[PDB]
Short mmCIF file of C-alpha atoms in Angstrom, two decimals:
data_model
loop_
_atom_site.label_atom_id
_atom_site.label_comp_id
_atom_site.label_asym_id
_atom_site.label_seq_id
_atom_site.Cartn_x
_atom_site.Cartn_y
_atom_site.Cartn_z
CA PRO A 1 -5.04 -19.45 20.09
CA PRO A 2 -8.27 -17.93 18.55
CA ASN A 3 -11.57 -19.39 20.01
CA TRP A 4 -12.27 -19.41 23.76
CA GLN A 5 -13.94 -22.85 24.20
CA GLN A 6 -10.96 -24.30 22.29
CA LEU A 7 -8.74 -23.39 25.25
CA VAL A 8 -10.84 -24.90 28.05
CA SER A 9 -11.29 -28.62 28.50
CA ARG A 10 -14.83 -29.56 27.30
CA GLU A 11 -15.36 -31.46 30.56
CA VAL A 12 -15.02 -28.34 32.77
CA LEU A 13 -17.26 -26.37 30.41
CA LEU A 14 -20.04 -28.79 31.38
CA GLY A 15 -19.94 -27.31 34.83
CA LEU A 16 -20.24 -23.66 33.82
CA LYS A 17 -23.49 -21.74 33.75
CA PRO A 18 -24.64 -20.62 30.27
CA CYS A 19 -24.38 -16.96 31.31
CA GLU A 20 -20.86 -17.72 32.54
CA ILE A 21 -19.94 -19.09 29.12
CA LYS A 22 -21.16 -15.81 27.53
CA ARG A 23 -19.10 -13.79 30.04
CA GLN A 24 -16.02 -15.73 28.98
CA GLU A 25 -16.71 -15.23 25.32
CA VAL A 26 -17.00 -11.45 25.69
CA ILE A 27 -13.89 -11.17 27.90
CA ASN A 28 -12.17 -13.12 25.17
CA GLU A 29 -13.42 -10.73 22.52
CA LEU A 30 -11.75 -7.88 24.40
CA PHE A 31 -8.50 -9.79 24.67
CA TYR A 32 -8.51 -11.12 21.08
CA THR A 33 -9.30 -7.80 19.34
CA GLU A 34 -6.59 -6.19 21.48
CA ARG A 35 -4.11 -8.69 20.02
CA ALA A 36 -5.44 -7.92 16.51
CA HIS A 37 -4.99 -4.21 17.28
CA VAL A 38 -1.41 -4.64 18.37
CA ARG A 39 -0.69 -6.55 15.17
CA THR A 40 -2.09 -3.70 13.07
CA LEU A 41 0.06 -1.21 14.90
CA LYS A 42 3.16 -3.38 14.24
CA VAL A 43 2.23 -3.13 10.48
CA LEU A 44 2.31 0.72 10.59
CA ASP A 45 5.53 0.47 12.54
CA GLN A 46 7.33 -2.23 10.64
CA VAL A 47 6.17 -1.73 7.04
CA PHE A 48 6.09 2.10 7.07
CA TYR A 49 7.73 3.93 9.92
CA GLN A 50 10.83 1.82 10.58
CA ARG A 51 11.62 1.38 6.83
CA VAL A 52 11.16 5.03 5.80
CA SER A 53 13.14 6.23 8.77
CA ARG A 54 15.98 3.89 7.72
CA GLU A 55 15.83 5.14 4.10
CA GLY A 56 16.12 8.74 5.31
CA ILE A 57 13.54 10.00 2.80
CA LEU A 58 11.72 12.16 5.36
CA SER A 59 13.06 14.96 7.53
CA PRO A 60 12.74 14.96 11.34
CA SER A 61 9.69 17.25 11.00
CA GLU A 62 7.94 15.25 8.23
CA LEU A 63 8.40 12.06 10.24
CA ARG A 64 6.81 13.82 13.21
CA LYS A 65 4.01 15.27 11.19
CA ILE A 66 3.20 11.80 9.59
CA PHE A 67 3.72 9.31 12.50
CA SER A 68 3.91 11.48 15.64
CA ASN A 69 3.65 9.29 18.70
CA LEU A 70 3.15 5.97 16.91
CA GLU A 71 6.01 4.57 19.10
CA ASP A 72 4.01 5.29 22.33
CA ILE A 73 0.62 4.06 21.18
CA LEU A 74 2.46 0.97 20.06
CA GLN A 75 4.21 0.35 23.46
CA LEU A 76 0.94 1.18 25.25
CA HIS A 77 -1.13 -1.44 23.40
CA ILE A 78 1.64 -4.06 23.66
CA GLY A 79 1.74 -3.46 27.48
CA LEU A 80 -2.04 -3.65 27.68
CA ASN A 81 -2.02 -6.83 25.61
CA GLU A 82 0.63 -8.33 27.92
CA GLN A 83 -1.53 -7.56 30.98
CA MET A 84 -4.47 -9.26 29.28
CA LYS A 85 -2.27 -12.30 28.57
CA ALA A 86 -1.27 -12.39 32.26
CA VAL A 87 -4.85 -12.31 33.44
CA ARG A 88 -5.32 -15.65 31.61
CA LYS A 89 -2.07 -17.11 32.90
CA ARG A 90 -3.49 -16.83 36.46
CA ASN A 91 -5.05 -20.33 36.25
CA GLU A 92 -4.54 -23.39 34.00
CA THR A 93 -8.35 -23.69 33.46
CA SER A 94 -8.20 -20.87 30.84
CA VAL A 95 -11.38 -19.80 32.60
CA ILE A 96 -10.98 -16.21 33.72
CA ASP A 97 -12.44 -15.26 37.07
CA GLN A 98 -12.80 -11.67 38.31
CA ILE A 99 -11.71 -8.86 35.96
CA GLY A 100 -13.33 -5.59 37.08
CA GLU A 101 -10.24 -4.58 39.02
CA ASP A 102 -7.97 -5.18 36.03
CA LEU A 103 -10.27 -3.10 33.85
CA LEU A 104 -10.04 -0.38 36.45
CA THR A 105 -6.21 -0.55 36.37
CA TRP A 106 -6.21 -0.41 32.53
CA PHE A 107 -8.83 2.30 32.02
CA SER A 108 -8.93 4.52 35.13
CA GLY A 109 -6.39 6.44 37.16
CA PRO A 110 -2.89 6.43 35.59
CA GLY A 111 -4.07 3.91 32.99
CA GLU A 112 -6.78 6.32 31.80
CA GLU A 113 -4.35 9.31 31.74
CA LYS A 114 -1.73 7.47 29.77
CA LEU A 115 -4.22 6.13 27.15
CA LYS A 116 -6.24 9.30 26.73
CA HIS A 117 -3.13 11.51 26.30
CA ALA A 118 -1.36 9.18 23.96
CA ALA A 119 -4.38 8.45 21.82
CA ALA A 120 -5.31 12.18 21.83
CA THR A 121 -1.90 13.06 20.41
CA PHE A 122 -1.88 10.29 17.75
CA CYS A 123 -5.49 10.68 16.74
CA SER A 124 -5.78 14.53 16.76
CA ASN A 125 -2.76 14.58 14.49
CA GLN A 126 -4.43 12.41 11.90
CA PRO A 127 -5.67 15.20 9.56
CA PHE A 128 -2.21 16.79 9.68
CA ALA A 129 -0.56 13.39 9.03
CA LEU A 130 -2.83 12.46 6.10
CA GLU A 131 -2.22 15.79 4.43
CA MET A 132 1.51 15.54 4.87
CA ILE A 133 1.48 12.07 3.28
CA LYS A 134 -0.36 13.54 0.23
CA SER A 135 1.95 16.53 0.02
CA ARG A 136 5.10 14.36 0.12
CA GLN A 137 3.55 11.98 -2.45
CA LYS A 138 2.90 15.02 -4.65
CA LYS A 139 6.35 16.64 -4.31
CA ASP A 140 8.81 13.81 -3.61
CA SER A 141 9.23 10.89 -6.03
CA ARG A 142 11.28 8.93 -3.50
CA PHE A 143 8.46 8.96 -0.96
CA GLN A 144 5.78 8.23 -3.56
CA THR A 145 7.88 5.22 -4.55
CA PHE A 146 8.42 4.17 -0.95
CA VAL A 147 4.75 4.35 -0.09
CA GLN A 148 3.60 2.49 -3.21
CA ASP A 149 6.13 -0.25 -2.62
CA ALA A 150 5.18 -0.54 1.07
CA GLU A 151 1.44 -0.72 0.38
CA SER A 152 2.11 -3.62 -1.99
CA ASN A 153 3.28 -5.64 1.10
CA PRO A 154 0.62 -8.35 1.78
CA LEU A 155 0.51 -7.27 5.47
CA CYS A 156 -1.33 -4.19 4.27
CA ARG A 157 -4.16 -6.30 2.94
CA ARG A 158 -4.70 -3.90 -0.10
CA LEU A 159 -5.14 -0.88 2.20
CA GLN A 160 -3.32 2.44 1.92
CA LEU A 161 -1.30 4.19 4.67
CA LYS A 162 -4.11 6.70 4.86
CA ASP A 163 -6.50 3.81 5.64
CA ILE A 164 -4.37 2.09 8.30
CA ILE A 165 -3.63 5.11 10.41
CA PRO A 166 -7.24 5.65 11.44
CA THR A 167 -7.16 2.22 13.23
CA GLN A 168 -6.16 3.88 16.55
CA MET A 169 -9.29 6.12 16.68
CA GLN A 170 -11.52 3.18 15.70
CA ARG A 171 -10.13 1.04 18.52
CA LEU A 172 -10.97 3.67 21.06
CA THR A 173 -14.64 3.71 19.89
CA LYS A 174 -14.71 -0.06 20.63
CA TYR A 175 -13.64 -0.18 24.30
CA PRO A 176 -16.93 1.12 25.72
CA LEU A 177 -19.03 -1.51 23.93
CA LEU A 178 -16.66 -4.36 24.77
CA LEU A 179 -16.79 -3.44 28.48
CA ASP A 180 -20.57 -2.92 28.46
CA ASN A 181 -20.89 -6.50 27.16
CA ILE A 182 -18.67 -7.90 29.85
CA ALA A 183 -20.87 -6.02 32.36
CA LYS A 184 -23.99 -7.47 30.76
CA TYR A 185 -22.93 -11.05 31.58
CA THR A 186 -21.56 -10.27 35.02
CA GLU A 187 -23.97 -11.49 37.66
CA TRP A 188 -22.52 -10.50 40.98
CA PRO A 189 -22.93 -6.84 41.86
CA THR A 190 -19.50 -5.78 43.20
CA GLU A 191 -17.77 -7.18 40.13
CA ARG A 192 -20.35 -5.75 37.72
CA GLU A 193 -20.17 -2.28 39.28
CA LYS A 194 -16.43 -2.18 38.58
CA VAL A 195 -16.85 -3.31 34.99
CA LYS A 196 -19.46 -0.60 34.35
CA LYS A 197 -17.26 2.02 36.05
CA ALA A 198 -14.34 1.13 33.71
CA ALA A 199 -16.78 1.24 30.79
CA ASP A 200 -17.76 4.83 31.74
CA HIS A 201 -14.08 5.79 32.02
CA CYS A 202 -13.57 4.35 28.51
CA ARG A 203 -16.38 6.65 27.43
CA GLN A 204 -14.65 9.61 29.16
CA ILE A 205 -11.38 8.72 27.36
CA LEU A 206 -13.13 8.51 24.02
CA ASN A 207 -14.83 11.89 24.59
CA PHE A 208 -11.43 13.50 25.47
CA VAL A 209 -9.89 12.04 22.37
CA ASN A 210 -12.84 13.07 20.19
CA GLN A 211 -12.69 16.67 21.44
CA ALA A 212 -8.99 16.96 20.69
CA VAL A 213 -9.74 15.59 17.21
CA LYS A 214 -12.38 18.25 16.62
CA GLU A 215 -9.99 21.02 17.86
CA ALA A 216 -7.35 19.66 15.51
CA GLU A 217 -9.55 19.23 12.39
CA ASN A 218 -10.47 22.94 12.80
CA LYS A 219 -6.78 23.98 12.92
CA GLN A 220 -5.74 21.81 9.97
CA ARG A 221 -8.55 23.31 7.86
CA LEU A 222 -7.17 26.75 8.64
CA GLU A 223 -3.62 25.65 7.98
CA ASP A 224 -4.86 24.59 4.56
CA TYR A 225 -6.69 27.89 4.07
CA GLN A 226 -3.55 29.76 5.24
CA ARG A 227 -1.55 27.88 2.61
CA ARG A 228 -3.95 28.66 -0.28
CA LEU A 229 -4.13 32.36 0.78
CA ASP A 230 -3.04 34.64 -2.10
CA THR A 231 -1.82 38.16 -1.23
CA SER A 232 -0.68 39.07 -4.78
CA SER A 233 -2.26 42.55 -4.95
CA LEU A 234 -0.48 43.82 -1.78
CA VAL A 235 -0.99 48.20 4.57
CA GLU A 236 1.62 45.97 6.32
CA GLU A 237 -0.73 44.07 8.66
CA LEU A 238 -2.76 42.70 5.77
CA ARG A 239 -0.19 41.02 3.48
CA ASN A 240 1.44 39.12 6.38
CA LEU A 241 -2.03 37.96 7.52
CA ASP A 242 -1.82 34.72 9.45
CA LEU A 243 -5.16 32.92 9.89
CA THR A 244 -3.47 30.21 12.02
CA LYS A 245 -2.76 32.56 14.97
CA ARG A 246 -6.47 32.62 15.81
CA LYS A 247 -9.15 29.92 15.91
CA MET A 248 -11.89 29.70 13.24
CA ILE A 249 -15.49 29.84 14.46
CA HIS A 250 -17.48 29.77 11.21
CA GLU A 251 -17.18 29.59 7.42
CA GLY A 252 -19.36 29.60 4.30
CA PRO A 253 -20.32 30.97 0.89
CA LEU A 254 -21.43 34.64 1.10
CA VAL A 255 -22.07 37.05 -1.78
CA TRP A 256 -20.85 40.69 -1.81
CA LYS A 257 -23.09 43.38 -3.32
CA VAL A 258 -20.51 46.10 -4.08
CA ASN A 259 -23.00 47.92 -6.33
CA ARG A 260 -26.42 47.06 -7.76
CA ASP A 261 -24.63 46.24 -11.03
CA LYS A 262 -21.78 44.10 -9.59
CA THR A 263 -21.42 41.07 -7.27
CA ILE A 264 -18.31 39.29 -5.91
CA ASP A 265 -18.97 35.64 -5.00
CA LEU A 266 -17.09 35.03 -1.73
CA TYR A 267 -16.05 32.34 0.63
CA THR A 268 -15.88 33.99 4.03
CA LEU A 269 -14.28 33.10 7.32
CA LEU A 270 -15.38 34.19 10.75
CA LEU A 271 -12.33 33.95 13.04
CA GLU A 272 -11.87 34.86 16.73
CA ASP A 273 -11.24 38.54 16.08
CA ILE A 274 -11.67 39.18 12.33
CA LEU A 275 -14.06 38.42 9.52
CA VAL A 276 -12.11 37.55 6.38
CA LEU A 277 -13.38 38.02 2.87
CA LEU A 278 -11.88 35.69 0.25
CA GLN A 279 -12.55 34.74 -3.41
CA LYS A 280 -12.55 31.16 -4.80
CA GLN A 281 -10.31 31.47 -7.90
CA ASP A 282 -9.41 27.89 -8.89
CA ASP A 283 -7.12 26.62 -6.07
CA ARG A 284 -6.32 29.97 -4.44
CA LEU A 285 -8.10 32.09 -1.83
CA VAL A 286 -7.54 35.75 -2.65
CA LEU A 287 -7.11 38.62 -0.19
CA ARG A 288 -7.85 41.82 -2.20
CA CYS A 289 -10.26 44.80 -2.65
CA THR A 290 -10.16 51.52 0.12
CA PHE A 291 -12.52 48.69 1.26
CA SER A 292 -10.53 46.12 3.33
CA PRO A 293 -11.24 42.36 2.94
CA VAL A 294 -10.29 42.02 6.63
CA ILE A 295 -12.89 43.52 8.95
CA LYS A 296 -11.82 43.94 12.58
CA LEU A 297 -14.67 42.59 14.77
CA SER A 298 -13.74 45.14 17.47
CA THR A 299 -15.51 47.80 15.37
CA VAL A 300 -18.39 45.83 13.86
CA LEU A 301 -22.12 46.40 14.08
CA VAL A 302 -24.45 44.05 12.23
CA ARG A 303 -28.07 44.52 11.13
CA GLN A 304 -30.50 42.46 9.05
CA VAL A 305 -31.71 44.07 5.79
CA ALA A 306 -35.46 44.80 5.40
CA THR A 307 -35.41 45.16 1.58
CA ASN A 308 -32.79 40.41 0.90
CA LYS A 309 -31.87 38.02 3.73
CA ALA A 310 -28.48 39.65 3.77
CA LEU A 311 -26.70 41.67 6.42
CA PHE A 312 -24.98 45.00 6.74
CA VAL A 313 -21.63 44.47 8.31
CA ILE A 314 -20.55 47.89 9.40
CA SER A 315 -16.94 48.68 10.28
CA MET A 316 -16.20 51.74 12.44
CA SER A 317 -12.97 53.75 12.19
CA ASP A 318 -12.19 57.14 13.75
CA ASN A 319 -13.37 58.55 10.37
CA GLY A 320 -16.82 57.02 9.97
CA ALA A 321 -18.24 53.81 8.53
CA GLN A 322 -17.80 51.46 5.59
CA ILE A 323 -20.68 49.09 4.82
CA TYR A 324 -20.43 45.58 3.45
CA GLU A 325 -23.68 44.11 2.18
CA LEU A 326 -23.18 40.31 2.37
CA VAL A 327 -25.90 37.93 1.16
CA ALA A 328 -26.14 34.29 2.30
CA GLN A 329 -27.91 31.52 0.41
CA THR A 330 -30.74 30.92 2.91
CA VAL A 331 -32.51 32.68 5.77
CA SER A 332 -31.41 29.95 8.17
CA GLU A 333 -27.65 30.40 7.57
CA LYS A 334 -27.58 34.23 7.73
CA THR A 335 -29.14 33.97 11.21
CA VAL A 336 -26.18 31.80 12.22
CA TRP A 337 -23.80 34.31 10.57
CA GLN A 338 -25.46 37.23 12.38
CA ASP A 339 -25.64 35.40 15.69
CA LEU A 340 -22.00 34.31 15.57
CA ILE A 341 -20.45 37.55 14.27
CA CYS A 342 -22.20 39.39 17.14
CA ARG A 343 -21.10 36.73 19.65
CA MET A 344 -17.47 37.21 18.58
CA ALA A 345 -17.78 40.99 18.15
CA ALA A 346 -19.22 41.48 21.63
CA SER A 347 -16.54 39.17 23.07
CA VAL A 348 -13.63 41.32 21.84
CA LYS A 349 -15.34 44.58 22.91
CA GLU A 350 -15.83 42.93 26.33
CA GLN A 351 -12.13 42.01 26.79
CA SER A 352 -11.26 45.74 26.62
#
């Protein structure tokens, strides 16, 4: 059933406090939107994952990169939904009594660990999964066809695969507010304290998931940059350069004053241990030039320039020094560039 007061006899509702009616309504919101959530996840599963897997269009690795641990977030939310159903089945009144302890079972201890790890895996994979969907649409007619057919299913409600997948992350943003509202209409202190504790755990879970998502969006950006990387001009280190084997710390548009007469417009990447100088030539990102486009941070000294708001990046070999004059677009950003290059440069020189 959908409404709460529809369940309960009207003649037992007469006896409930107003605040107690609000409590029931908000517990019912948590239960109801969990059922809605489950239903959404069965759409991903039934319309997309199960069908495509049966058609054999995707490889084991493409499947994994698109859907990952869909199966476990599914079983998790069905189990959670079943436990919510059972809480109601405890009395024929359809009036729910105490719930703090259930919320603590669902969202702390092993319940917290299971949800946060499963959601962290599904959700942190999202940028990888959305890009793999586009790349298979772009390269494989059979999967483009499959996806277009599937999204025509009414269960999709005119929404694309790319738009349904993000339903897991959204759900996790909702738990804290749902539990705060239950707490709000909980009068008696021992019960309320439990509700609010579970609410804070839901916040902890969300923060763990969010941080994994951030880590992952940074890696998928790199993986994209690593794909577009064009070593056409290339001694051996440089042409096999793999951005993905270190984390990216910063990126932006710099300029490169090679002479007074000439200027190479760059897009530049500060990584853990190297600064990387690239050129935006249509789709590609070019690694080219005795002046290397990869500057080892282990040798770098940086200094502001008295005469634009540029910097001298100065690489030290056993010979002497090369100097890159790199000019950012504002004063504010070159202070970030300077501050971060030096942070990373002094970190590598420290680890020696």
